[PDB]
Amino acid sequence: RNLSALKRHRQSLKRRLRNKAKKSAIKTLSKKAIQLAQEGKAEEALKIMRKAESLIDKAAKGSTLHKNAAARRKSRLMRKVRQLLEAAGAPLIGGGLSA
Amino acid sequence: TAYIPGEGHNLQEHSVVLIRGGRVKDLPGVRYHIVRGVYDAAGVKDRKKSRSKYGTKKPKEA
Amino acid sequence: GRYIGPVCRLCRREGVKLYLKGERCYSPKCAMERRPYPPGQHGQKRARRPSDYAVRLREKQKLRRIYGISERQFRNLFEEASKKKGVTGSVFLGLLESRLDNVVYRLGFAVSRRQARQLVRHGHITVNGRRVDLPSYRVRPGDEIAVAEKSRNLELIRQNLEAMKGRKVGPWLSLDVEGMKGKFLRLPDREDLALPVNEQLVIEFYSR
Amino acid sequence: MVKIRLARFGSKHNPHYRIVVTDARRKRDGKYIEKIGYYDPRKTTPDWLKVDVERARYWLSVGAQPTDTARRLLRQAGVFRQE
Amino acid sequence: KRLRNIGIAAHIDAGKTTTTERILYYTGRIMEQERERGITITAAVTTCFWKDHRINIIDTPGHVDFTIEVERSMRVLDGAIVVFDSSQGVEPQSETVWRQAEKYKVPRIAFANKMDKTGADLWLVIRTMQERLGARPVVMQLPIGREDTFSGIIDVLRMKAYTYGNDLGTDIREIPIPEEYLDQAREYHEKLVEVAADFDENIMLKYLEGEEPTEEELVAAIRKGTIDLKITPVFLGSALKNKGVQLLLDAVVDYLPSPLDIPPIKGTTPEGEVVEIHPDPNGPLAALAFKIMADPYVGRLTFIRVYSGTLTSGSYVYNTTKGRKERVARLLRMHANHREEVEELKAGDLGAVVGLKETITGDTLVGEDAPRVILESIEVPEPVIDVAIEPKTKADQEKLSQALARLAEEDPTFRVSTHPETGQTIISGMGELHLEIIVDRLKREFKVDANVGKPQVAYRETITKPVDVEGKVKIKVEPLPRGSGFQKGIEEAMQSGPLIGFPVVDIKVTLYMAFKIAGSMAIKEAVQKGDPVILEPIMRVEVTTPEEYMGDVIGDLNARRGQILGMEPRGNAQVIRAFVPLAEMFGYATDLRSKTQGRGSFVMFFDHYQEVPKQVQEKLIK
RNA sequence: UGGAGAGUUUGAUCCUGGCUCAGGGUGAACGCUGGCGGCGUGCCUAAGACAUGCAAGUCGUGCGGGCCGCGGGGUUUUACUCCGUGGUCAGCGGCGGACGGGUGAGUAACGCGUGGGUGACCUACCCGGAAGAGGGGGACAACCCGGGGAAACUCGGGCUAAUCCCCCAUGUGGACCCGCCCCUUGGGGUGUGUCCAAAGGGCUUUGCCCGCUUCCGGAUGGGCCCGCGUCCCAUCAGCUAGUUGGUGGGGUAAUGGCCCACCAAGGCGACGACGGGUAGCCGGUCUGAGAGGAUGGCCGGCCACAGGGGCACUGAGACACGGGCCCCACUCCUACGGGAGGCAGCAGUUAGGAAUCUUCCGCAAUGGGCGCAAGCCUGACGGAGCGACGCCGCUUGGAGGAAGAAGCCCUUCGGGGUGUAAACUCCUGAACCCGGGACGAAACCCCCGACGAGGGGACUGACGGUACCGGGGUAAUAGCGCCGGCCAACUCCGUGCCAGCAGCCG
Numbered sequence A: 001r002n003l004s005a006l007k008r009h010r011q012s013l014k015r016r017l018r019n020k021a022k023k024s025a026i027k028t029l030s031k032k033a034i035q036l037a038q039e040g041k042a043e044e045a046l047k048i049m050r051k052a053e054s055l056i057d058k059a060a061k062g063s064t065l066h067k068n069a070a071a072r073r074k075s076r077l078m079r080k081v082r083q084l085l086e087a088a089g090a091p092l093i094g095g096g097l098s099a
Numbered sequence B: 001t002a003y004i005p006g007e008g009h010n011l012q013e014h015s016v017v018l019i020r021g022g023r024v025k026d027l028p029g030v031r032y033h034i035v036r037g038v039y040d041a042a043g044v045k046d047r048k049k050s051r052s053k054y055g056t057k058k059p060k061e062a
Numbered sequence C: 001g002r003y004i005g006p007v008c009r010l011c012r013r014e015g016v017k018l019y020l021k022g023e024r025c026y027s028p029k030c031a032m033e034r035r036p037y038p039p040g041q042h043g044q045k046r047a048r049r050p051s052d053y054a055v056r057l058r059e060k061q062k063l064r065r066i067y068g069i070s071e072r073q074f075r076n077l078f079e080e081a082s083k084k085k086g087v088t089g090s091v092f093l094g095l096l097e098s099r100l101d102n103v104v105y106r107l108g109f110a111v112s113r114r115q116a117r118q119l120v121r122h123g124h125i126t127v128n129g130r131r132v133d134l135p136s137y138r139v140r141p142g143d144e145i146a147v148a149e150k151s152r153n154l155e156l157i158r159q160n161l162e163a164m165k166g167r168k169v170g171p172w173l174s175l176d177v178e179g180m181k182g183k184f185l186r187l188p189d190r191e192d193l194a195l196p197v198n199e200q201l202v203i204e205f206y207s208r
Numbered sequence D: 001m002v003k004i005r006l007a008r009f010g011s012k013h014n015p016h017y018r019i020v021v022t023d024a025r026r027k028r029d030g031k032y033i034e035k036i037g038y039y040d041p042r043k044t045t046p047d048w049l050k051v052d053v054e055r056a057r058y059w060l061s062v063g064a065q066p067t068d069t070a071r072r073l074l075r076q077a078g079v080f081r082q083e
Numbered sequence E: 001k002r003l004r005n006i007g008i009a010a011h012i013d014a015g016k017t018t019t020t021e022r023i024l025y026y027t028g029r030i031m032e033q034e035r036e037r038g039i040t041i042t043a044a045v046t047t048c049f050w051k052d053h054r055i056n057i058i059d060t061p062g063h064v065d066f067t068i069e070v071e072r073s074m075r076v077l078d079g080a081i082v083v084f085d086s087s088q089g090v091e092p093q094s095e096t097v098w099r100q101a102e103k104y105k106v107p108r109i110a111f112a113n114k115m116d117k118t119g120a121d122l123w124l125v126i127r128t129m130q131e132r133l134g135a136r137p138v139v140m141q142l143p144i145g146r147e148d149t150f151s152g153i154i155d156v157l158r159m160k161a162y163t164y165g166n167d168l169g170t171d172i173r174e175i176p177i178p179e180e181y182l183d184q185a186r187e188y189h190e191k192l193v194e195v196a197a198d199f200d201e202n203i204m205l206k207y208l209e210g211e212e213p214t215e216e217e218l219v220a221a222i223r224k225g226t227i228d229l230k231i232t233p234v235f236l237g238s239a240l241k242n243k244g245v246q247l248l249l250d251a252v253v254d255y256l257p258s259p260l261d262i263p264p265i266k267g268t269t270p271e272g273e274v275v276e277i278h279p280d281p282n283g284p285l286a287a288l289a290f291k292i293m294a295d296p297y298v299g300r301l302t303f304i305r306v307y308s309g310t311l312t313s314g315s316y317v318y319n320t321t322k323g324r325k326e327r328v329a330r331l332l333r334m335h336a337n338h339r340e341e342v343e344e345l346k347a348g349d350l351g352a353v354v355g356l357k358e359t360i361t362g363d364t365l366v367g368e369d370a371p372r373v374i375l376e377s378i379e380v381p382e383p384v385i386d387v388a389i390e391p392k393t394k395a396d397q398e399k400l401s402q403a404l405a406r407l408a409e410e411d412p413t414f415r416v417s418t419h420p421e422t423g424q425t426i427i428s429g430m431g432e433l434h435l436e437i438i439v440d441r442l443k444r445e446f447k448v449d450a451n452v453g454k455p456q457v458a459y460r461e462t463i464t465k466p467v468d469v470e471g472k473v474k475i476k477v478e479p480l481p482r483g484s485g486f487q488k489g490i491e492e493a494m495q496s497g498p499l500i501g502f503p504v505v506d507i508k509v510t511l512y513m514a515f516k517i518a519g520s521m522a523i524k525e526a527v528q529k530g531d532p533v534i535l536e537p538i539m540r541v542e543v544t545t546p547e548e549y550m551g552d553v554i555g556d557l558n559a560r561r562g563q564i565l566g567m568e569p570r571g572n573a574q575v576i577r578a579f580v581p582l583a584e585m586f587g588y589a590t591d592l593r594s595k596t597q598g599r600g601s602f603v604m605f606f607d608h609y610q611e612v613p614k615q616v617q618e619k620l621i622k
Numbered sequence F: 001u002g003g004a005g006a007g008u009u010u011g012a013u014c015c016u017g018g019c020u021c022a023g024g025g026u027g028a029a030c031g032c033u034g035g036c037g038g039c040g041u042g043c044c045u046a047a048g049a050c051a052u053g054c055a056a057g058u059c060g061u062g063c064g065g066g067c068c069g070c071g072g073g074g075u076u077u078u079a080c081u082c083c084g085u086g087g088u089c090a091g092c093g094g095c096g097g098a099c100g101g102g103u104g105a106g107u108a109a110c111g112c113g114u115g116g117g118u119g120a121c122c123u124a125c126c127c128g129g130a131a132g133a134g135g136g137g138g139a140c141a142a143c144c145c146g147g148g149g150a151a152a153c154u155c156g157g158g159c160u161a162a163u164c165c166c167c168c169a170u171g172u173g174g175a176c177c178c179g180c181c182c183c184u185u186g187g188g189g190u191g192u193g194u195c196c197a198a199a200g201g202g203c204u205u206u207g208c209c210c211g212c213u214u215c216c217g218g219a220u221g222g223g224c225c226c227g228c229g230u231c232c233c234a235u236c237a238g239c240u241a242g243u244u245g246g247u248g249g250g251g252u253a254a255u256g257g258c259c260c261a262c263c264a265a266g267g268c269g270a271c272g273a274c275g276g277g278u279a280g281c282c283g284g285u286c287u288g289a290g291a292g293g294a295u296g297g298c299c300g301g302c303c304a305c306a307g308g309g310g311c312a313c314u315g316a317g318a319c320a321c322g323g324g325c326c327c328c329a330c331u332c333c334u335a336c337g338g339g340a341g342g343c344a345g346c347a348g349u350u351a352g353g354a355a356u357c358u359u360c361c362g363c364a365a366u367g368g369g370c371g372c373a374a375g376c377c378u379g380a381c382g383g384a385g386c387g388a389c390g391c392c393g394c395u396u397g398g399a400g401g402a403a404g405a406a407g408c409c410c411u412u413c414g415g416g417g418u419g420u421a422a423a424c425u426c427c428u429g430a431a432c433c434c435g436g437g438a439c440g441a442a443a444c445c446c447c448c449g450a451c452g453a454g455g456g457g458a459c460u461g462a463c464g465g466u467a468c469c470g471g472g473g474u475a476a477u478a479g480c481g482c483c484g485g486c487c488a489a490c491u492c493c494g495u496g497c498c499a500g501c502a503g504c505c506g
C-alpha cells in the first residue's frame, strides 16, 4: 500500500508555504513602492523599493524565484518607481537607484 | 446466410458455427461459407480426399 | 527435405537420366535403359505437346532433382544468383556446385549425391581440418575438403577412394587419393559441367 | 551527465557492444551522441576491442564520465596513459 | 500416510455443514442461493490438521439434485463420514449416498448427530442402519442423557467417558463412567471384541479365553474391518452443541483409511490394457479433475486428486481424456478461512489449480511427457427432468445460451439440447430444485431472465379410412398398421397436416412441374376426406420402486393416461414397465419422487406414435 | 541488371469494357498433419474491468531518537538497563521518483518530417577556470503527554538535532535602474546607486576524501519561433470577439492575444477558410520494372496519453504512469463513525474476440538511481519457458537389390502400373546413454606507486552440467493441396440437374 513519495508530498507542502510567504511579501512591497512613487513620496518609495529588491534577490537564492525572474521583477519595479517619481520627484533617498 | 459445404451435415437451430467468407455463384446473397470441423459443425464423414477443407480427421489405416 | 523416396523414377519422368544412385544409374538398370517413360498408369501414352510452363517447370525440376535440394533452398539459391554479379544462369550453377554435399560427390568420396549428404551429415567430412555436417555448406575457392581421420579407413571410404585411383576429378578441383584430401580451386565454368539442363529456361521459370 | 558507455548490439548469446557517448538518461540502446569504439567481450575476432582515443579524450575533457566497464576498456587502449 | 481424505455425506439437514463447520475450529487451535434457499449446493475441499494428520474434507450436498457432488467426492476421497439426524434415523437420501459409497468402495463411519433433539435415539439409527441399508453398525460409543439432558459421551472400546458442561466445546474434560451405563458399558467391550474377533485372530482366541485384548490391536482390528467395508463404526454427538466432535475427529484418524489402505485405482493406457496406478510420489503423474469452479478472484479453479506422482506448480500437463496440453499455473489449498498457495501436490493429495482452460470433471491429467493413461473417472448420472427455456426478451438469446454452455460445463448432470423438430432449447437436470437453482442462477449470476415451460410435443397425423381421389390425376389412400411408414408432389404435402399442421404418416398412396401440383392438391384433400386423427408420441417407461409404493405408483401412471405392461424385480426393489404419452410425462420425476419418498427412479425412451383420446384434438386445434 | 499474361459479351470477328485468376507479402486466424534445433516474434478486439505478487529507491560519511544482538561492569548480577559498535525502525534532511518501462485513446496540428532561427531562453548531476566557506539566531517531526478511533491512524500541548529555516557580515563576482562607449531586436563593456552567497561530514589530521556558496566558460539535454511537406467529403462556402493589429500591463527561463485593461477594425477563405469524417507522425516496411501504390506491428527517433475531465504544488525539470487537489464514472473495506482504489509497468485474471505466452530465472552481463565505499535497489535488462506464428538449418536413412514377389489399380485377359519401391545384403549411426565441459569476466575493490599513469592480487555466471568436445550407440515421424481450362498432373467405379463442386468460364 505505502510508498514514501508520501515524504515528497509532506515536503512539497512545507516549501509551498515557504515560497507563498516570500512571494506575497514581494508583491505587497513592490506594490507599496509603486504606489508611493505615484504619490510622489520618493524617500519612502525608494526606501521600500530597496526592501523589495532585497527580498526578491533573497528569493532568487533557492527555489522560490530564480534567474532572469528576480532580475525582471527588479527591472520592472525600478523602471516603474523611477518614472512615477520623475513626474514631480527628485530622487530624495539617493539610495536604491543610479544617479 | 452461409453455405454449408460437404455431403451431409449436423446443423440445426442453435448450432454454433464458424463463418468463412467466400460466396457461391448460385445462391444469391450467400456471401459466406461455414467452416466444417469447427464449433458445432461436424466434419464430413467418410471424406477421404480433400479432407482439410470439410474439417475431416485423417482416417485410421488400422 | 532431400526428398527420400524412389529416385531412378525421376532418373525418369524428366525423361533424362540424372545420376541419383551413382553406381547403379550406370548398370543396364537406371530404368532410362529399361523403362525410359514416365511413371504411372499412363507414362507410355501419347505425349501431349508441353505448355510453355511445363517446358520450364520440367527444366527447373530437372536441375533441382540433380542436386537433391528443396525448392525453398533452390529458389533462394537462385534469387541469390540473380542479385549476384553477371550471368545469373552460369553463376547459379556455380553456387549449386559449391555446395558441400555436392563437392564431396565430385571428389568421389561418395558414389551418389544422396550418399555424399549422408557422409557429410555423419561427421565423415572435414573442411580445412574442422568437421562440417551441413550439406548446404558453401565451399569457397581454396578449401581443403578431406575425409575425417577417424573415418579414414571405413569400408565404404576405401572402396570409393579405390575407384578414385584411375579417375580425373573435374578441372576446378584437385584430389589426393593417397591422403584423401581435395581442393576446390575455382568456381565451375558453365561448360565444366555437362549438364542435361538448359539453365536459361530455369531463369525464365522464375520470371513468372 | 554525459557518459562513455556500452550500447548493446550483436544478438542473443552474441554480445557485441558499441562504445558510445550519450546522455546518461537515454535508454541503453537508444540514440547516442557519437560512436568511438566497439567491443566484443568474447574476442571471436582479433580486432575485438577498438577505440578512437583522440575522440574519447575530447569527450573525457568535456566532462563525460565513463562506465566502470568502459573505463577499463579505454585504459586497455591507453586513453589514460600519459607517458 | 498420516493423511485422511474424507467426505461428509448424509440426508438433507442431517447436519453435515454444521458438523464440518465445527471440525474446522477444533482443528483450528494453532455462497448465494445457499443463503436464500438454506441449502448446501456446492462443496469445496478444505484442509485442517488433527493429530499431526492432514484431513481433507468435502462437505456434500444432501439433495438428489446434486448427487453429482457426491458422485465425485466418493470417487476422489478415500473415506467417508455419514451423518444421521438421529431423531429420524436413516432417511431416503442417506440410502442414496450410501449406495454411492458402496460402488466406489468407501470405508466409512457414521455419526448419529443431533443427540440433543426431541426424539433423538441412537438405537433408531442403529436399527435403521441395519434394517434399511444392509449394513453392520458397531457401537463405538454411548450417550449420557436421553435427548434434552444429553450431557456426555461414553467411549466403549477404551472404557473411558467424557462430559461437556456448555454447548460451546470450551468445558469438556474426562470423567469416569457413572454406575448406570457401566453395566451397559462392558457388553460392547465386549461386543466390539466380539466383532473384532472376525478381523484379528489373536483377538478371536483371546476372546474365547475371557481375556480382553490390547487397546491398540482392537483399533487395528476395527479399522481393518471398516476398510474392508464390512463394518460401520457408529459414533454420536451434537455438532450444534459441541459434543462428540473431537471424539469424531479422533475416530477419523483411528479408523478411516489413508490413501495406502485402499486399492489404488486403475487406468487404461493407449495400448488398451487395464493397469493399476502405483501411488508413488516419484512415479509418473496421474490425477483426476473432479470439479470446475468459476471463482473470482483467481478465475477458473480446477480441483484435482493426485493418485500417482507429484504435481508441481508452474508446469505443463496433459489432459489425456481430451488430449489438450494444459498449464498448472499455481496450486492451491483451501483452509477454513484463507487459501494457501503451495508449490506442489503429491500422491494422495487434493488441491486446486489455476491455469487449466479445457479440463472438466472426470478428466484425467498426466505428466507433460508421461504415459498417457486414462483413469477410471466419475460416472454420468442421467437427468430426470427437462423444460423449454427461452429468454423473456431475445437479444438475451445469446447471453442465455452462452451461459447454459458454461453451466453444462461445470456440472455434467445438467444438459442443454435442442429439440430437433421445433428448435426450442431444452434444459435438463436432476430435479425441479435443480432447474430452479439454475434459472435462479441465470438471473443473479449471469444477468439473463428466462421463462420455463413444458416442451411442446412432436405430433403426427394419419387417416382412419381408405380413400380415392382426383387431383387436377387420381390416387387411392389407405391407412397402414401403427408404425409402418409410407410422387415427389405428394411426399411434399406430407409436411403439413390438416388439423394442427404436423407431419402425416403411416399411409399408402396408389397412383392410377405439372405432375407436382396435382399430387400435392390430391393428398392435401385425401387426408381431409380420409377423416383424420392426431397421433402423439408414446414413451416406454420403466420405473423402479421399493414394493411399498407400487399401488400408488401404478395408480398415478394410470392417472397419466398410461397402460401398464408388467412388473419384474430388479434386486432389492421392483420395476414397473408401461407406455405413457410424452405429454402426460412432464415433471414425472418429481411426482414420482413424492409417491416413493425419493426412492423411486424411472427411465423413458420413445417407442411409438398412436392416436389420442378424442378429448384433446378440439382442445388441440388451438 | 529491368517489365510474361490468361479466361469470360458473338453464329463467328475486331474493338471497347468490366468481372475473374496465376505472384509476392502479414503481429495473423481456421482445417488436416507435425520430428529436431537456432534466431526472431506473439491481445491487431474492450484506451473494458481487474484478485495476487513484484516493477523506486538509496545515503548512518547530513541529523536526533526508538528497538535489538553483542563487546566493556555498573548494586556482584536479574530491579534504577552506563559507556563503546553493528544491526534494525520509522522520522527529519539530501539525491533519485520528470529517466527507465507501457500504450496509440486524442491530435489534420509546427503534432511530425526536413531545414533553419533565439540580439527571445533554460539545462540538476559532469568538466575547465576564479574567488569564498566569517559571525549570529530559530522551528518542525522523531520523541514524551493528553483528547479521538473499530482500525486506518488523527488532533492538541510540550522537548529536540542537522547539510532544515532565518538574519548579519565579506562581494571574487553577479543582478537591477540610469548615463557613457562599442555592437545592433534584449549581444559585449563601463561608472556611480541599490540588492545577493554559503554546510558541514569522514579519516591514519596542521595533510588528504567527500560534500556547501558565488561567478565565468564548456559539455549534454531542453523550451519557444519560422520556410517548406503532411488523408477523404464542397451533398461542408463562407469563417472569426481575444477575433486581427496597436498601446500599456500581467505572466514565463523566454517571444507571443499566452492572459488583462484601453484604442483601432481588423484577420482568414476556391492556392479550399470553416465544418464533418478518418488518422498518432517519421527512420522504415510490403509490393512494384519503375514511377507509383499500400502500410507505420517488432527495433530506433519525435509527439500524446496514464479510469473521464479540469487544476495547480513541489522542483533544474512535471502540470507528474506506480505524487497531490476537485468534479464525474465505476469498484472495495466498514463496528455505518468513516476509509480505500486506479496493470496503456512484468506476470497473471476476467470479459470481448477468429486470435496472441510464464502469476518463470537472474541481477553473472550491459545500462540506470543512490552511496566515499562496501553495497543496496532495478519485471530496464540478460536469460530461460510456452506457441510451426515467422525465417534459416537439420532428420525420417545410404549403397546394393528382379525384365520386376505379394497386395491393390487398370486390362485389348498376352500384359501394363505402383517400382528399386518393398522384401533381402551390406554400410553409416538422429535419437539415446557415458565421460569431460565452456566463452560470455574484468573490472569496481586490495596492495606497490601518489587513492594519477603505470605494475601486481582477489571476488564474481542467471542462462547451465546448457552449448560444445571425446567415447559408446538404435534404420529411426510424413503429411497437405491439386490433376476440366487458366495450371504441372488421368484412368476405373459409384452417381445420374440428385448428391454435390465452384475463383471465373461453368
Ligand SMILES: Nc1nc2c(ncn2[C@@H]2O[C@H](COP(=O)(O)OP(=O)(O)CP(=O)(O)O)[C@@H](O)[C@H]2O)c(=O)[nH]1
Binding pocket: E010, E011, E012, E013, E014, E015, E016, E017, E018, E019, E038, E039, E040, E041, E060, E061, E062, E063, E113, E114, E115, E116, E117, E237, E238, E239, E240, E241
Ligand atoms: N438440534 C440439533 N440440530 C442440528 C444439529 N446440527 C444441525 N442441526 C440443525 O439442522 C440444521 C442443519 O443445517 P446443516 O448443518 O447445514 O445441515 P446439512 O445437512 O448440511 C443441510 P444440506 O443437506 O442441505 O447441505 C442446523 O442449522 C440446525 O437447524 C445438531 O447437532 N443438533
Ligand SMILES: [Mg+2]
Binding pocket: A028
Ligand atoms: Mg496583501
Ligand SMILES: [Mg+2]
Binding pocket: B050
Ligand atoms: Mg474438389
Ligand SMILES: [Mg+2]
Binding pocket: E012, E013
Ligand atoms: Mg428434515
Ligand SMILES: [Mg+2]
Binding pocket: E016, E017, E018, E039, E040, E060, E061
Ligand atoms: Mg449442508
Ligand SMILES: [Mg+2]
Binding pocket: E037, E038
Ligand atoms: Mg430448509
Ligand SMILES: [Mg+2]
Binding pocket: F009
Ligand atoms: Mg452483345
Ligand SMILES: [Mg+2]
Binding pocket: none
Ligand atoms: Mg493438433
Ligand SMILES: [Mg+2]
Binding pocket: F110
Ligand atoms: Mg518545422
Ligand SMILES: [Mg+2]
Binding pocket: none
Ligand atoms: Mg509586453
Ligand SMILES: [Mg+2]
Binding pocket: none
Ligand atoms: Mg516552469
Ligand SMILES: [Mg+2]
Binding pocket: F279
Ligand atoms: Mg486514433
Ligand SMILES: [Mg+2]
Binding pocket: none
Ligand atoms: Mg506495373
Ligand SMILES: [Mg+2]
Binding pocket: none
Ligand atoms: Mg484501463
Ligand SMILES: [Mg+2]
Binding pocket: F322, F343
Ligand atoms: Mg500502475
Ligand SMILES: [Mg+2]
Binding pocket: none
Ligand atoms: Mg470468448
